[PDB]
Design a protein around this ligand. Structure first.
Ligand SMILES: CO[C@H](C(=O)CO)[C@H](O)[C@H](O)CO
Ligand SMILES: CO[C@H](C(=O)CO)[C@H](O)[C@H](O)CO
Ligand SMILES: CO[C@H](C(=O)CO)[C@H](O)[C@H](O)CO
Ligand SMILES: CO[C@H](C(=O)CO)[C@H](O)[C@H](O)CO
Ligand SMILES: [Mg+2]
Ligand SMILES: [Mg+2]
Ligand SMILES: [Mg+2]
Ligand SMILES: [Mg+2]
Ligand SMILES: [Mg+2]
Ligand SMILES: [Mg+2]
Ligand SMILES: [Mg+2]
Ligand SMILES: [Mg+2]
Lengths: 386, 386, 386, 386
């Protein structure tokens, strides 16, 4: 049933199937995976590519000899499978030197080091073929109010992203940045907590065009927000450069369940939106196989991610294609939302008696929107009871 | 103790002390207040001004005769007290014609009417002296996913705000707009749910400079976000045109408690920020006296709003002025966050061996940030145990 | 297909399809429904019965002849359709006199009135054949800490429930009580906020056997709790006397969406539990059709409530009947969970060297739980992908 | 000043100041603390005692001579300082074998091992003079619906607690059990998620009197519940055997901030309740110093825990002692809440015409509760503004 193909553009980070199971209250339940074995098993599952943090490929502290060998094995696995590397990122959160941040650490020397660690991995990403470079500022923030002046930390954050933009422009590299928002965890509150904050920030950068967002399903759901609405605003702004798919069941710690789990109706409305907007980037899964699972449970969770996307794609396409749904969208006046409010400008509007003086407000008030019927047709499609 | 003065710029909406107590499960517990009596009692309490929605001043459905009289009584109360009207807004949410929105209603004729109702009140606000005009799109959103295409609704929302901007520019009016974000209630999800989303949106308008945000304490706390951080990003972007103060105790329905209640530490860090950034606009309270109270409980809740602001102002000023706190900020390296990461550009950074090759990552990793000590000094100041 | 018949025990409150659309920020969008027309329209939809608050059937302040006339015409609608009244309840939250509670109001005279209003409706409910009497204390609680001494409020709440138990026992009525928990709204915090708190409270009443819980889907989800887990504990305790079914999309105000909407996977696991535990009570819908809808959208939403329960009933039955799922459950050792840990007793467990000193901890640690495979079979069944 | 002395019963877990800073996204930022140095540094801070998990004092897999040696040097640190051990607990969550639970693991052999690991530490705790034995089932739960049959898991959980009760009773040990509830983390949902669910469960055990609750501030706040209300119900039930004090800033991952931080007003109302109810147990701090801190920030955070409890103790005592507050409480009729509703009985209440037919409902509806004035007196006392 529903098999992944390379044209579905499913990708996974080395850190997702590679998660060993270490959590705040417990030790690892799985052995470390070799990146080479991960590229091979994912190519067998039907994935199109893999992503990585620098510390997933090259152990922190590796000499340039050991680094070369790691990179070399990895590149041989890719070349043998035809797997691509669409995106890459830096780990600016695991090592204790980043306990107060990377780009917005209060210590200047830590900020400089964070920038050098990042530029080094940007050079590697570009030769491996990555066209999107992701920044998740997991340690940028605070647990207490005087620990961080946020206006000055946004200057430092703007300064870091402007220097990265200056560096790829002078190298003539074809790579764009995507900021990944998260409202909290591991910091009490993280800077640029949602898609909207990250979008507003990009507009204050010296080269706005170089930067977009990499929203994640479970991160906007950790603030109780509607992830399809956030994604529609990122698409409206032209800034959906990448997306991270997974599941989350409410406002609690960051779960990273496989895609489809968590809020199932929101995953349906997200696939419907991505598919009807013709989003063309990777469908990247950033999930963690639960630590209850062994390695077979890992590849079953990874396969379940892609399967759930393909079943929802099919139900959504069937929803939109149904004549009765099309008729119900006309009835709920979704065609009329697409017509301009006042295409002849404000002076026509002002002159129009029917827009105010003679508007029958109670006739209009009494029209039913027919939204429940439309939503129960969407329910029957999702459940295949239509 | 702590008496409000006109220079504190405390303002209140007619709808706040005027709330009759009607809620989703219950009828009104208080009689309607006359606007004239509200201007007089608030001037006696030490408030500086009042704000209003059009339907708070002039009953929906009033003829231009009855409208004139309402406006006339109101203006006499203001002139007699010296009360100002700093801001005004439209009610695009109470009447059943707005059940699916005002500016983003699916029905085109409702959107045109919403625009005419708004322009009419913009003319009144400007003659009363309002310099900020607030838009709270309470009904813009949905309870179900196919009921609203969000990309098209943002076109309609951009179109409405661009027409309002064209109208005040051609009239030569000195009035700016402030968008008030709210994540949900009364709609399942409201469009532009947080400060960040509202900030990002403004940047796509034809005249960005005309528009800023009016954030509300309890609204960003309904998505579990840190309100002082959201306000610091609005100030960093130059867009804090106005602010609404109240309290909220967590992620639940919108409470509108008096300012100081709810998250007390966040109110302290907010006053500290507003006062040290030299914000100069109104300190507006948008709160609801609980329906358990009679009219004396109403003016006690309203007075408590201003009192709590003045006690926190004093504790914050004392925190920042203390030599021991200043020494603790140097120790947590808050002065170093203010220094540029790499003011000699990316090529100096790249050349610098000490930024990477020779950086002693474990010496840096081992420096303690001394944040708990700094936060316990902030705790002793707030509690006056210092 | 999925057509409801009275055999399915689907019931609806008069206040559900009869909600007019008045919310915290808006007026009514629909006309009041006559109880008589609600009884016949629901009988046609396939419903089994209706429930009521005293003030839904008899307008507050009715003279006893008007009271009698209302009951009389209701009773004849019931008799002509074969509709039943399984449950009734009291409105102790709408009138201004209940602004601080009914049974735990600080004013003693109000607490005596609340008990007399309730006893009058217990006599009426027993005459119409109600077997469960629900108590939703929506006004028992507080917005501030010193307003309510909670240990004393629980003494007053125990006092009220013991007096109602004494009353129905002296009348020899065959009726039982079900407490409906809600964490908040309309009070800042409500007493007995979840299923667990209501279950613990019942054990301290004089006649515990007379009382159980009426959990509501959306109420436990407002505290972010797992509603199928909460129902499993109420069933394990033998106290699930009734249930209210609806949808909620996260921690926010109380939405009362139609059942199936909100968290769809929790609706599936709930039906799987009710059906396999053999719950025999009413499947009651306490939902509110959105105020965007006219009277036709009202009956469409009500009909979708029943349709979604019947589609999920079928997918849950198919899931459990599948040999491959049955095999997946043995693989995840759900059969072993049913075996007693130590039926051999404590001294045999203590003498058992294989339970401790010779237990191979690393061999057990390495067994995967196979939970993700199992959950994807559940997902495939829910979506009809098998 | 606010100096802690052993008379204040302040206790700390070895795992609290001993947390190394390893979190879901990062490695340790601090070295392990020796138990012996923790006992003496806390005795100097004014603490009264320490608590431990078996694996905090004796590293997992210690041979019995290494076990004996660890206990021996711990016991001599204790004896030299006069420090006590009021409470102990078992670690049934860290080792990989507990990845599906201890007492409710699907594997039966793991459940027998979990009981043997616990009985071994009950013998040790009683030798060191512990009177309360805490059980925090952090791994009892699930991330998916079919993984755990919750009615059967509660049978296994009852079975485990009844076997521990049989064991301490046959040993004639004077020790009682306290269940610590948490809604989630590290499992998607944890069994017995709140105080109420643990209280209800206890009533179904064989010897209910042997068991109570150990509520934690931050755990109930992760479900958005009012922690002082939850403690008032545990005290009303006579089951508050122990308490864990810390801070949490909302519904998100579990922070374990120092007490006083997070929701400051709930910390004030909590201390007001513990002190006026006369709670006599340990004021235990289960918090984690942020990983931004070195060992000096660790002892500063621990010291702030005790300081904040003593400042709030003083403000709560001053609030209740104030004649003006005492007068405000009569005005809000908190004296009337203490009067029985109907000590005259049901037939006298039924015959009482002033309770219903002659009750003036509109006169009672009009009495304001004066709760906002009262809450602002509380606010003034908390901030030391009076
Ligand atoms: C470990 O996953 C990270 C995340 O989402 C945090 O919740 C990011 O995906 C990573 O930094 C690269 O983007
Ligand atoms: C009734 O208060 C409103 C609000 O905040 C909704 O939660 C706005 O303040 C009003 O529309 C003017 O801004
Ligand atoms: C409006 O419905 C009520 C409720 O749940 C509100 O949250 C109860 O269902 C009713 O009082 C009887 O159960
Ligand atoms: C790390 O501490 C534990 C906990 O609360 C985690 O949420 C318990 O306190 C401990 O197992 C004994 O009570
Ligand atoms: Mg995540
Ligand atoms: Mg991610
Ligand atoms: Mg509000
Ligand atoms: Mg507002
Ligand atoms: Mg509800
Ligand atoms: Mg209900
Ligand atoms: Mg905790
Ligand atoms: Mg604890």
């Amino acid at each position: 049933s529903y098999q992944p193909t390379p044209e579905d553009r499913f990708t996974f980070g080395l850190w997702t199937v590679g998660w060993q199971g270490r959590d705040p209250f417990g030790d690892a339940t799985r052995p470390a995976l070799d990146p080479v074995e991960t590229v091979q098993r994912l190519a067998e599952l039907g994935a199109h590519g893999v992503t990585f943090h620098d510390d997933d490929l090259i152990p922190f502290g590796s000499s340039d000899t050991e680094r070369e060998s790691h990179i070399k094995r990895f590149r041989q696995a890719l070349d043998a499978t035809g797997m691509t590397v669409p995106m890459a990122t830096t780990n600016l959160f695991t090592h204790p030197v980043f306990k107060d941040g990377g780009f917005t650490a209060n210590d200047r020397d830590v900020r400089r080091y964070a920038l050098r660690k990042t530029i080094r991995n940007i050079d590697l990403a570009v030769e491996l073929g990555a066209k999107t470079y992701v920044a998740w500022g997991g340690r940028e923030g605070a647990e207490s109010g005087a620990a961080k002046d946020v206006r000055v930390a946004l200057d430092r954050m703007k300064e870091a992203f402007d220097l990265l933009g200056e560096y790829v422009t002078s190298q003539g590299y074809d790579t764009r940045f995507a900021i990944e928002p998260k409202p909290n965890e591991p910091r009490g509150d993280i800077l640029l907590p949602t898609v909207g904050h990250a979008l507003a920030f990009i507009e204050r950068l010296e080269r706005p065009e170089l930067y977009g967002v990499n929203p994640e399903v479970g991160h906007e759901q950790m603030a109780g927000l509607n992830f399809p609405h956030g994604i529609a605003q990122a698409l409206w702004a032209g800034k959906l450069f990448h997306i991270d798919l997974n599941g989350q069941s409410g406002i609690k710690y960051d779960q990273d369940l496989r895609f489809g789990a968590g809020d199932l109706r929101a995953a349906f409305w997200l696939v419907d939106l991505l598919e009807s907007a013709g989003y063309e980037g990777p469908r990247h899964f950033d999930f963690k196989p639960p630590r209850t699972e062994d390695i077979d449970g890992v590849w079953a969770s990874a396969a379940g991610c892609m399967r759930n996307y393909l079943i929802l794609k099919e139900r959504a396409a069937a929803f939109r294609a149904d004549p009765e749904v099309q008729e119900a969208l006309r009835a709920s006046r979704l065609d009329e939302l697409a017509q301009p409010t006042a295409a002849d400008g404000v002076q026509e509007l002002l002159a129009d008696r029917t827009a105010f003086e003679d508007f029958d407000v109670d006739a209009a008030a009494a029209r039913g929107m027919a939204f429940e019927r439309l939503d129960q047709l969407a329910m029957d499609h999702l459940l295949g009871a239509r």
